[PDB]
């Protein structure tokens, strides 16, 4: 009866300014977020070209990737509303010139 409420409640939780990882998790938060289109998973493996808080550029080494276009883009979404009037904005992680792989954040 108590875990029922503990589960029904943590989905009305309101996000805040600076996200802080839990210190006692269950290794499942790695899965939910990745498995919902709020993150930006790199399609092809390469190196960061130029990143700023509006878009990301990735040049792909075609040697170890299938036929590609040598450059792809990802456009960030700053302060887009959502049905409950909560702010949505993605923030980049990577730095200039980093080795990333297909299926990373």
């Amino acid at each position: 009866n108590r875990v029922l409420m503990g589960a029904n409640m943590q989905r009305q939780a309101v996000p805040t300014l600076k996200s802080e990882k839990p210190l006692v998790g269950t290794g499942m938060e790695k899965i939910v977020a990745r498995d919902s289109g709020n993150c930006i998973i790199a399609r092809n493996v390469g190196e960061v070209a130029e990143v700023d808080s509006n878009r990301i550029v990735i040049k792909v080494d075609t040697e170890k990737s299938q036929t590609s276009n040598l450059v792809d883009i990802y456009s960030l979404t700053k302060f887009k509303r959502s049905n409950k009037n909560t702010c949505i904005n993605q923030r980049p992680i990577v730095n200039v010139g980093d080795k990333v792989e297909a299926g990373d954040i």
Binding site: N1, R2, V3, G6, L23, V24
Partner: protein, 53 residues
């Protein structure tokens, strides 16, 4: 005003103990124990890192 450990750090929240036993959501206690542990392990690394980087 909050209670504070001997070191000097104060405590943020003051929950109530009478809740837990009656409505048997024990797991919260064990979560607090593990959390204390993690917070100790943090201060350890900090001490080792406040010198000789």
């Amino acid at each position: 005003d909050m209670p504070y450990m001997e070191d000097g750090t104060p405590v943020d929240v003051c929950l109530n103990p009478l809740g837990i036993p009656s409505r048997m959501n024990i797991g919260q206690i064990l979560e607090a124990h593990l959390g204390l542990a993690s917070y100790g392990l943090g201060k350890k690394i900090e001490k080792t890192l406040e010198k000789t980087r």
